[PDB]
Amino acid sequence: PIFLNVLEAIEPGVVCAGHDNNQPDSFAALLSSLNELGERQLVHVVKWAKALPGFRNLHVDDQMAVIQYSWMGLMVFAMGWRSFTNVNSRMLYFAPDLVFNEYRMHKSRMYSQCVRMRHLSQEFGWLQITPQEFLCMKALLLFSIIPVDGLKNQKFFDELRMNYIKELDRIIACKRKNPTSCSRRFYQLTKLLDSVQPIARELHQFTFDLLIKSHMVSVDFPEMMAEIISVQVPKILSGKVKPIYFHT
Numbered sequence: 001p002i003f004l005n006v007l008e009a010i011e012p013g014v015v016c017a018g019h020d021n022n023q024p025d026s027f028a029a030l031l032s033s034l035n036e037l038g039e040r041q042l043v044h045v046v047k048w049a050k051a052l053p054g055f056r057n058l059h060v061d062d063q064m065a066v067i068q069y070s071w072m073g074l075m076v077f078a079m080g081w082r083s084f085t086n087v088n089s090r091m092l093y094f095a096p097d098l099v100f101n102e103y104r105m106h107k108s109r110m111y112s113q114c115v116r117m118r119h120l121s122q123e124f125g126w127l128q129i130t131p132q133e134f135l136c137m138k139a140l141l142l143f144s145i146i147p148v149d150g151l152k153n154q155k156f157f158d159e160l161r162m163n164y165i166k167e168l169d170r171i172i173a174c175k176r177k178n179p180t181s182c183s184r185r186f187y188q189l190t191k192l193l194d195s196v197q198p199i200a201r202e203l204h205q206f207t208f209d210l211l212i213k214s215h216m217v218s219v220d221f222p223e224m225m226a227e228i229i230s231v232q233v234p235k236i237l238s239g240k241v242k243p244i245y246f247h248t
């Protein structure tokens with residue numbers, strides 16, 4: 001249908017991190033590249049979102065808010081997809097010029113977090129997620145985290161989230177036969193989406209601390225990345241902004 005054409009048509013393309021693979025691996029270089037990749041990946045997310053159906057309805061402030069709160073969850077989820085479709089979850093495919101292997105996962109000083117990411121990446125396979133399901137879930141991640149005191153126009157956001165959830169159902173109801181698996185498939189995806197939040201929160205904490213002592217470890221932080229991680233992120237780790245789980 002129309003909805004599906006849009007999502008597949010506004011799906012961001014390949015994005016390099018600009019990492020110089022000629023130089024030996026070093027924490028500084030690796031994380032600095034990831035930050036640069038983040039800044040780059042953020043530009044596409046902004047445009048990707050503005051081109052999203054009904055997104056232009058939210059108040060301009062809520063448009064930037066939701067983007068500054070779930071950018072981590074979106075990029076991680078998408079990255080997990082590339083890893084599955086490119087290297088079959090064997091490694092973390094952040095970018096064509098920035099693939100993480102067992103070694104780099106250790107050199108990045110965040111091996112545990114990578115494990116969970118390589119785990120999310122494998123879920124796409126264990127559950128046999130389809131392209132249509134992936135695209136629909138990613139968009140729903142954009143509307144998966146908001147401040148406890150709601151947004152400027154919560155009503156509009158709830159209906160916007162409600163409608164995207166409906167699209168997921170239709171996508172799911174376009175290949176099933178009996179309800180035994182139908183209403184069941186919904187349970188699987190809803191779980192997968194929720195498993196993303198925990199991972200995202202761990203990375204949030206990590207980038208935060210890394211930013212605090214960025215000068216001592218010589219890790220560069222792009223302008224935008226620096227403002228969001230110091231102004232937006234803190235609100236999440238403080239409890240002001242909490243994700244939206246389907247299950248408890």
Ligand SMILES: C[C@]12CCC(=O)C[C@@H]1CC[C@@H]1[C@@H]2CC[C@]2(C)[C@@H](O)CC[C@@H]12
Nearest residue numbers: 034035037038041075076079094203207
């Ligand atoms: C979102 C990015 C970059 C885009 C992506 O593919 C997922 C990946 C997950 C780890 C993030 C990284 C951006 C830079 C961060 C936030 C580092 O500071 C620490 C964790 C890194």
Ligand SMILES: O=C(O)c1ccccc1Nc1cccc(C(F)(F)F)c1
Nearest residue numbers: 003053054057159160161163164167
């Ligand atoms: O377009 C609006 O008026 C709208 C308003 C609030 C929430 C969602 C909205 N539209 C919307 C929301 C999800 C999916 C689709 C569609 F699939 F039709 F494109 C349209």
